[PDB]
Subunit: 314 residues, 4 copies
């Protein structure tokens, strides 16, 4: 919140790179308006002796129903870059998604420890992409976050792409899935039948996402498709969502709509630009407290109870 | 209306304590927007020889379908504090809810006479809470208003808590109910099944309320849940509502949606900060006239007829 | 449109008397917002050899699906007062509603000729009211417009009430109906069952109206209830509507929703305050042209065809 | 976008002639608001080896699902006028609609080559209108775009009407259809049954259009009727739409709602006023790129796939 004010002050067009959406930015604003019209129906008088925000996802415990979204070139925002964010994420018990275009090599990020995920962009040489998957799995990464909604970038630098493009198809997905034992997570699913097909294709999860409004301008917000997608998947895979998550109440709204967890992107970068690793740990601490507070006020002792909350659209 | 202008002038951060909501204050604004989109379908040409705003509630007559909402530390707004409000409420024939955190002891408020209700916050020692219930019942209070939507405060001083916390559960509710012959009223019910369970638990009433938008930010407004809750309860208990009631037309809207009565909080404090007891009696007089006018223009000779009015959402 | 700018310039609080609504004026604004969200589905390629805006209503032809709404004390706006408006209305072929509180006697207005209607306010002496009905019928008035939505005025002067109050009930309606052979028209009907009962009570018409937002604040706009009321009445009586009619497209919208005709109030007064009788005739000429244009663009050769147009809400 | 800024700078009331709508311009704004509330549900992971924006329409290939809308007197915006626009349209592979009120004769426009369509206004002498149809067909025009929504203009100059009015009926449509072998396209269809009748009358296409909000003020936007009309026609004719198409995402939205193609009017004139033929070719190049980008991000290799995209209203 006030964090973005600090990120704006400290350069200036790097900000617009971080904050911007594609085209008219109609999908960027719509992510927020979609969240703002969701209302939670809280439950009262339930035992809260042991409110816990922990979830199990991909066989591993997380402190919050949240992971750091893949954002490229994190040294654009702070000299420590991805190493700072990955350290704070590890300390907070939340997974950190290593970006294919990270300004620090993925093996260095994975060495920080914690719960590193690796976001894969499909390269036009198939075996370069599959090599990236092997490096991630060798480095102890716990999941392959296959970004599918970027056949090309939706309509500067510096400093480096320390890990070193084509449209990804369902064949690319099967190639990754055959090449790894890690859960494959498809990021950028918006159509209900794409979610069903993702389960059929063997994905361990999907991220319901319009890329923070950065790919197709006019794409439906992920939060607007979340409940339909959760019903269609019927527990067949983890369903994450991102786009405009700015508070613990937003996390609660997402989980009440059925999400397993959320990704948080831009705010984590604001906390990185302002106060580096300590600033990220600060944001994660604030988010952890807000999630815990929102869940208790809503009568939910666990994230699973929060998923059973009803909502109303306003 | 103009009263809040007088309350703002007379200190300054005490105002923000009285007016504010939690988080983004989305539920605070939504209480008002929910009321503003309700439209009443008035009835014409009915006999109005004896329009009466009186209701029976908890075996006792009230002059209006309204009671003063529990607001803590009323000496923050005027030296007479709760004694002034309780006196004006008594003179107006409307019940007054004594707050657990009242800046004047509950026995003194009850001595003013009238129709005192007592709002209970659950204390972590059960028998301290049950003692508070006994003191209220011994003091002639007519109802226990069990505030349920505060397991803890949703995200200064002075002057005193003259009557001297843990999450309240359904077990706490049964303990109160077993300890008193007074009707137990659960304040902060928003879920339809919580309303049904409240009747099953033996409550004499519920207040459909998101705490004036002060607990869970993003909680659905009570007025948005009122009609569903009234149908589900099917006369099993009294159903009150609060949040943003600012006029007699708002009272009419609430009763047309099925409420037995409304609570009024912040406006009564504005009338207390500006002109003390006389100012509260002024507000209650104005509200009484507006309710009577709204009911007549709507073709309702009684509050019960007003409950049978249809509405349309705009 | 620009006419109201001229009315504002020429005194000043008389303006607010003419333009204002009751309470928060939520029903005044809602009359306009309701009209603005109605969209007409025009028909194409129909023969328009003889587009006519004429209707038959109460056995008499009118040049437009429109009559001048009853507005009291028309000398507040111009020295000629009601005589000016009645003359222009006569020349335009539209009925003129004589108000019970007219600043010129009803017999003088009726002498102007044309199609005078008489709006009745119920007086607390029944036989005074029935005398007013007899005077109107003796004076050649063609309809009794019984204003029902004023049991009392919803929450100055000079100059006179040249024709010289209690709540009107269904008994008052039957007394009028038994006392006259003129069609009785109930003005201020908003509830579907009040419309049905109006037909059962022998009314020749109803005006679906929230009194221009001047009676119950928060009353549903008449245009929002019009289509439901038209279906329920099933041709049993004429169904008029008023409130916010500001153009020929608005007249078309009203007729497409099923109205037999509209009443126009405030704009006719603006035309009276600015340029007197010639100004009213100007407004009626402009409205007549806009209605004719709107009907042709919508593919309607007659008002009856316009009533069969479909609409969509936006 | 920025093009309109250049068109505004370069005279001034000619701008208002180009940009304006009829009446309150409620239908002009509604064309845009209707498009802005449509959201596309993109598909992921489909093969995009050969994304093509080409369509077949009236037996001829077009480079884009788009044609230049008929706009009169194009020398009002640039000395080259229609010849400039027709040349750029030809070079871009998009059809160009010759206007009946063109400031350059239709035979000269058709000589530019490409895919000229001819927009017919019905003249009150039938055989003058049918002569215009014969001239267009003799000149190599590929379709008669019969403008039906102008029985008269909905509520200056210079320079000329180089080709040299009555309401057009279904009889006029049959006269044209009997007089030409070219496909007849009815422009200005908004009612579902008018679309069905258009197919029954032998039309080869319709343009779902409220004339850019320039005819009936308060007419429903064409985009709001598009999906219903497409279902009712059931492939019986081509269904085009116009009004507020300002980007490739808008083209995608229109095709996802079922349109065969869009017409683009005002933006093409802005590109003509600013930089003449080169400016139009620039706009068509930008639109071609945006359409291609939007289609790929939406997972559509062809316009036909784009027509099978689902949408959600926001
Ligand atoms: C600057 C930047 C860079 C990237 C992304 C977003 C921003 C703002 N994103 C989107 C991010 O992963 C979340 O989807 C979004 O930030 C959630 O919305 P939020 O910021 O409101 O919390 C990326 N996603 C990928 O998959 N791959 C990438 O390279 C990536 O393009 N780089
Ligand atoms: C300053 C203050 C203090 C309290 C409350 C509200 C305000 C503004 N409230 C909410 C109040 O009871 C109504 O729910 C609300 O005011 C209706 O909305 P309104 O102000 O638009 O009429 C309380 N409720 C409890 O149960 N216990 C309390 O200690 C209490 O927290 N103190
Ligand atoms: C100043 C004034 C006076 C009256 C009314 C309205 C205004 C503004 N009206 C309302 C009017 O008849 C139309 O219902 C309304 O003007 C339509 O809305 P509009 O102005 O947007 O066209 C009356 N109605 C009655 O029945 N008896 C009356 O004495 C009356 O109170 N005097
Ligand atoms: C200045 C002008 C002139 C015409 C039209 C529109 C404008 C703005 N139009 C409307 C145009 O064909 C599209 O329907 C509209 O421009 C789409 O909306 P858009 O501008 O947002 O893309 C015409 N249509 C006809 O059929 N015959 C004509 O003589 C025509 O009246 N001349």
């Amino acid at each position: 919140a006030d964090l973005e004010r600090a990120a704006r002050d400290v350069p200036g067009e790097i900000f617009d790179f971080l904050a911007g959406g594609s085209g008219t930015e109609a999908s960027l604003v719509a992510n927020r308006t979609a969240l703002e019209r969701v209302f939670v129906i809280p439950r009262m008088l339930r035992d809260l002796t042991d409110v816990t925000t922990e979830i199990d996802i991909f066989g591993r415990r997380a402190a919050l129903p949240m992971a750091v979204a893949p954002v490229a070139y994190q040294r654009l925002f702070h000299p420590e870059g991805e190493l700072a964010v990955a350290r704070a994420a590890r300390d907070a018990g939340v997974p950190y998604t290593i970006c294919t275009l990270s300004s620090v090599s993925l093996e260095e990020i994975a060495a920080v420890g914690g719960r590193p995920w690796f976001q894969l962009f499909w390269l036009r040489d198939e075996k370069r992409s599959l090599d990236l998957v092997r490096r991630a799995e060798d480095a102890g990464c716990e999941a392959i976050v296959f970004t599918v909604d970027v056949p090309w970038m939706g309509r500067a630098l510096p400093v480096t792409a320390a890990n070193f493009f084509a449209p990804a198809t369902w064949e690319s997905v099967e190639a990754v899935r055959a090449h790894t034992d890690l859960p494959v997570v498809l990021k950028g699913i918006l159509a209900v039948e794409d979610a069903r097909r993702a389960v059929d294709a063997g994905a361990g999860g999907i991220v319901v996402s319009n890329h923070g409004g950065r790919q197709l301008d006019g794409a439906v917000p992920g939060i607007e498709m979340l409940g339909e997608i959760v019903a269609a998947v019927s527990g067949g895979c983890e369903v994450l969502v991102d786009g405009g998550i700015r508070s613990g109440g937003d996390v609660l709204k997402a989980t009440a709509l059925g999400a397993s967890a959320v990704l948080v992107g831009r705010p984590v970068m604001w906390a990185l630009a302002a106060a580096g690793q300590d600033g990220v740990r600060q944001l994660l601490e604030l988010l952890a407290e807000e999630v815990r507070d929102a869940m208790g006020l809503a009568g939910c002792e666990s994230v699973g109870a929060a998923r059973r909350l009803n909502t109303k659209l306003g």
